[PDB]
Write a protein that binds this DNA or RNA. Structure first.
Ligand SMILES: [Zn+2]
Lengths: 52, 191, 189, 77
RNA sequence: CAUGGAAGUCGGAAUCCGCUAAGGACUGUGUAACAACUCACCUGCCGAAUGUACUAGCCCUGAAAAUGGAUGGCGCUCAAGC
């Protein structure tokens, strides 16, 4: 098992992210535009699917 | 639209000395000395008062003015580092396989080296060498901590990111396998 | 800004009718505390504080109604209130000083003075001993009551109180904070 | 307590809004027990508070509990 | 009203008033049920701008074919481009 606080710390780096709908890039949680250039800085973002 | 005058100021405490020549900054204080080169930016440095440094840009564009604030905070970081230092902390997160590390001493030069063994039960021994001026220690306050300290934020932070990026899980669901080493706290040596 | 208009006429009307004005410097005091002193002083005097009146009292200085208003302009800095009353100076000197609450710590609150737990018997249920072991305090359970054999320093003066100790301070009814009304200099007294 | 007849058991499962009561000094008489617990400048404020307190009952007939309290035309005591 | 228990926060149906500058019969967390906690709202510091929705100029994404290759060539960046 993993201590609850440590699991929260690790989740920050690989669980709480936004995903662009055009190039599947990882984005910060509060982002509004993709940073990559090949998708044209699109603003069609969705949250990263949770584990359940 | 070009802005005529944009100015910023940096205070300097009465403990250290600073000298600027040909856009080459040298900062020296109680805890050591650092140098940075800013020859790629057109800035005019000046001494506003007895303990205030001024810098400004004339007839700059919107893109050019943006770099003015970037320069100000970088030099302030240099002043803090030479009088207060930096300190990073890291933690180990594992489910089944314990993670063993060995911070061996100086290898006939100033660099420190960290050895990581038994990551998710693999037979690789993986080695990373820190930048000069950075010292790595095993914490005794409590279990599973790495403490990194030094004078310059750029060297301390980049070396810390090197350790985190080397422990990666491949061909697995990363929402389930949270194994790895992560950074958890940033601060100064003093206070 | 309907309530904004009601402040302008209220301030000018009340200042002229009462010849005596007393200033109070209240800061970081619980809202409920103002309720009881308002109820205690409900019969005589009304207390009312709001945002700083940068030009609202200065307008009262322009006309010659009170040449002494312009003398009181620089005294306002921030979070300072005014009291309108007709009573004597001596009776209102300590009237608003009542009901100083014993504010508990807020998980990191700076203790101005060193806090110590005198030797004694807590008397509570011995199921809470896990809280004591967090600080590593030597405790012996006697008659179902946790007893501190030797005094143990909680936190040094001027140092941040530990989150476990700050919670532990609540059930011990000891805290470094006591919140009360602050009295500022009024009319060059 | 001023409710329509008895609150018989097994009848409160459905809607129980049939609690209409008259609006008179009977409610005002019950206000004297509280005696304006929080200021209210004696029973004058308490009467307005107690009068509008039973907002569910909607006072009596056409009159509403809010209108009676809003209209400052009744005697203090 | 509901009820082994539901105190804003299982659920069903209404949304008033005191005191104020402000705190909702409440947007969440949370208790067997209270609590604790969050939000909303107001106050202290600062010093001049700020928010949302639309129009069209240059630039970018959309833009994948077979011998080696063509603004005529070299080359050109406050142009030697518009
Ligand atoms: Zn994208």
């Amino acid at each position: 098992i993993i201590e609850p606080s440590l699991k929260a710390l690790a989740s920050k780096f690989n669980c709480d992210k936004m995903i662009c709908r055009k190039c599947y890039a990882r984005l910060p949680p509060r982002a509004t535009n993709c940073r990559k250039r090949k998708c044209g800085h699109s603003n069609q973002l969705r949250p990263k699917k949770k584990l359940k | 639209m070009r802005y005529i005058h944009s100015e910023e100021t940096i205070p300097v405490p009465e403990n250290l000395k600073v000298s600027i020549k040909s856009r080459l900054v040298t900062v020296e204080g109680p805890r050591g000395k650092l140098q940075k080169d800013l020859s790629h930016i057109a800035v005019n440095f000046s001494v506003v008062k007895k303990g205030v440094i001024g810098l400004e840009i004339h007839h700059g564009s919107r893109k050019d003015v943006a770099a003015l604030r970037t320069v100000r905070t970088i030099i302030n970081n240099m002043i803090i580092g030479v009088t207060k230092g930096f300190k990073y902390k890291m933690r180990y997160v594992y489910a089944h396989f314990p993670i063993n590390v060995n911070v061996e001493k100086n290898a006939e030069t100033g660099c420190y080296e960290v050895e990581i063994r038994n990551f998710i039960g693999e037979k690789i021994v993986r080695k990373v060498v820190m930048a000069p001026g950075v010292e790595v220690e095993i914490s005794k306050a409590q279990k599973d901590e790495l403490i990194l300290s030094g004078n310059s934020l750029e060297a301390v932070s980049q070396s810390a990111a090197d350790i985190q990026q080397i422990c990666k899980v491949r061909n697995k669901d990363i929402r389930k396998f949270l194994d790895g080493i992560y950074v958890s706290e940033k601060g100064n040596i003093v206070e | 800004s309907g309530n904004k208009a009601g402040y302008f006429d209220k301030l000018k009307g009340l200042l002229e009718e009462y010849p005596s004005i007393f200033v109070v410097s209240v800061d970081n005091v619980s809202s409920q505390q103002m309720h009881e002193i308002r109820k205690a002083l409900r019969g005589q005097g009304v207390v009312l504080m709001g945002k700083n009146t940068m030009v609202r009292r200065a307008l009262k200085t322009f006309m010659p109604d009170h040449p002494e208003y312009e003398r009181l302009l620089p005294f306002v800095k921030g979070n300072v209130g005014f009291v309108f009353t007709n009573g004597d100076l001596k009776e209102v000197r300590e009237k608003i000083l009542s009901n100083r609450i014993k504010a508990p710590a807020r998980a990191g609150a700076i203790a101005p003075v060193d806090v110590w737990v005198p030797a004694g018997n807590t008397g509570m249920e011995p199921g809470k001993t896990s809280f004591f072991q967090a600080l590593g305090i030597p405790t012996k359970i006697a008659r179902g009551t946790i007893e501190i054999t030797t005094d143990i320093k909680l936190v040094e003066a001027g140092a941040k109180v530990g989150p476990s100790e700050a919670t532990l301070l609540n059930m011990l009814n000891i805290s470094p904070f006591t919140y009360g009304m602050g009295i500022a200099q009024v009319y060059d007294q | 307590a001023l409710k329509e007849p008895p609150r018989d058991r097994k009848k409160e499962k459905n809607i129980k809004h049939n609690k209409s009561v008259s609006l008179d000094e009977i409610i005002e008489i019950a206000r004297t027990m509280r005696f304006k617990s929080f200021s209210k400048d004696l029973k004058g404020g308490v009467k307005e508070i107690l009068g509008t307190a039973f907002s569910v009952g909607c006072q009596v007939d056409g009159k509403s509990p809010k209108a009676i309290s809003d209209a400052i035309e009744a005697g203090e005591i």
